[PDB]
């Protein structure tokens, strides 16, 4: 029972890693779009900092 529980926990946490990498990529793309919109002048630094957080 302990071996099966530990292996299934590893199998779950690797998929959690993959979904966290996908979420981080989405957040990085949003930050790049907000940085571009700050460079052209449409948005302000008040939005760039919230995108950085």
């Amino acid at each position: 029972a302990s071996v099966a529980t530990a292996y299934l926990t590893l199998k779950a946490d690797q998929a959690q890693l993959q979904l966290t990498k996908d979420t981080l990529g989405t957040y990085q793309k949003s930050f790049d779009l907000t940085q571009r919109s700050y460079d052209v002048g449409v948005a302000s630094a008040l939005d760039l900092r919230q995108a950085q957080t």
Partner: protein, 52 residues
């Protein structure tokens, strides 16, 4: 009527007064709108230097 007749007048000398009383009122209205939009522009001119 702010002139005597049969005299010489210069350019821009005021001749009459035609009871403003309406033009004074909407001048007060336009000046009241200017007093808010000028402060808005003056505050945004300070804020845009730090990109706030």
């Amino acid at each position: 009527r702010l002139f005597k007749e049969g005299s010489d007048v210069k350019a821009g000398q005021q001749l009459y007064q035609i009871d403003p009383a309406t033009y004074e009122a909407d001048y007060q209205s336009a000046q009241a709108n200017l007093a808010s939009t000028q402060e808005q522009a003056q505050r945004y001119k300070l804020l845009v230097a730090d990109q706030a």
